[PDB]
């Protein structure tokens, strides 16, 4: 719920709307936002790379018995979305580029 | 010889692993459908079964779960390696289904 205090968080918007928003802010490489998946406790990171918006699914899992999030089916795990974003500003991980600029 | 289950479905593997206790590190290897060349590593972690594709390629024939970053000449070597080391896995393999 802290991700709601983040400006890169757009809550529940469609893929189309996320690509319009990223377009509006100039399709800069590493321009990104995070949003709700249409069908829960799941999210999409929408990221511009080489003038294209790509979409990375972030899925929740439990663990004794607390939720974490992952983009790689649990190989890399995060307590919350802020941790995930902050990680990927510095490390590409599975992404094609760093997260460089917030899409507001 | 135990861990290789020839061909069985994904579900069939989930049921086999299930009825052996859903324990951490409980695992089996199976052939895929298809890719007759392909294989799958069915592994239980947190009472959940996950399935890791094992694909062959050529440089020299090798298998990989991660597109060539980590290579094995055959399935046995991959298994033995992952008894000691996690690799891309969530836990070590230690129990044969």
């Amino acid at each position: 719920a802290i991700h709601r205090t983040q400006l890169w968080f757009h809550g529940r918007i469609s893929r189309e709307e996320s690509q319009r928003l990223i377009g509006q802010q100039g399709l800069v490489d590493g321009l990104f936002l995070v949003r709700e998946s249409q069908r829960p406790q799941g999210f999409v990171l929408s990221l511009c790379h080489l003038q294209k918006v790509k979409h990375y699914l972030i899925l929740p899992s439990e663990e004794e018995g607390r939720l974490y999030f992952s983009m790689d089916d649990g190989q890399t795990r995060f307590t919350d979305l802020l941790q995930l974003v902050e990680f990927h500003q510095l490390n590409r991980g599975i992404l094609p580029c760093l997260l460089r600029h917030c899409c507001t | 010889q135990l861990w290789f289950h020839g061909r069985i479905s994904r579900e069939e593997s989930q049921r086999l692993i299930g009825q052996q206790g859903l324990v951490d590190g409980l695992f089996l290897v199976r052939e895929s459908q298809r890719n007759p060349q392909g294989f799958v590593l069915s592994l239980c972690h947190l009472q959940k079964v996950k399935h890791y594709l094992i694909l062959p390629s050529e440089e020299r024939l090798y298998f990989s779960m991660d597109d060539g970053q980590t290579r094995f000449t055959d399935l046995l070597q991959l298994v033995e390696f992952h008894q000691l080391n996690r690799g891309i896995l969530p836990c070590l393999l230690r129990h044969c289904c």
């Binding site: 990375y56 699914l57 790689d72 190989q75 599975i94 | 594709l53 694909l55 991660d66 970053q69 891309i88």
Partner: peptide, 11 residues
């Protein structure tokens, strides 16, 4: 992978 997304990682 995840069908419909751009996730790429060890499968």
């Amino acid at each position: 992978w995840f069908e419909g997304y751009d996730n790429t990682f060890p499968c």
